[PDB]
Design a protein around this ligand. Structure first.
Ligand code: CPA
Length: 124
């Protein structure tokens, strides 16, 4: 089945755009990337950087993840991200999100060999 590394690219990477261009970005991306297939995922962040720059975070500042694991890493630099959060009108299968564009450091969890991101922990 889909690997954790591939799932991270499908749910969190958007190298094709530098930022969200309209308030409908989240609604369109959450549906196209199949994140709303089974239910409305409540929160999801998309990163507008090259995949190589995001994979490189696995060799940057080590930090504990929110849940305590120690395989988390914080990017040294800020990155262009789009934060998607479910709105009060969201109702499966018509999942609805608020689009927020920002520049923040990202924290991801890394695993395997090659050592790559497999989970998005937070934006700070
Ligand atoms: N600002 C935010 C806040 C939350 N989120 C998303 C990221 C998460 O999904 P995902 O990246 O698939 O991660 C979940 C998967 O990762 C796995 N996982 C969790 N911690 C891990 C760790 N330390 N090492 C490896 N895998 C881990 C469990 C599961 O399969 C989800 C809940 O944390 O919400 C976000 O996009 N932006």
């Amino acid at each position: 089945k889909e690997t954790a590394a591939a799932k991270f690219e499908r749910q969190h990477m958007d190298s094709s755009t530098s930022a969200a261009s309209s308030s409908n970005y989240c609604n369109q991306m959450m549906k196209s990337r199949n994140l709303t297939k089974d239910r409305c995922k409540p929160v999801n962040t998309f990163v507008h950087e090259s995949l190589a720059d995001v994979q490189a975070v696995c060799s940057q500042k080590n930090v504990a993840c929110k849940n305590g694991q120690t395989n988390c890493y914080q990017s040294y630099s800020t990155m262009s991200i789009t934060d998607c959060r479910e709105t009060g009108s969201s109702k499966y299968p018509n999942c609805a999100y608020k689009t927020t564009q920002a520049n923040k450091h990202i924290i991801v969890a890394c695993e395997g060999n090659p050592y790559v991101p497999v989970h998005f922990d937070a934006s700070v």
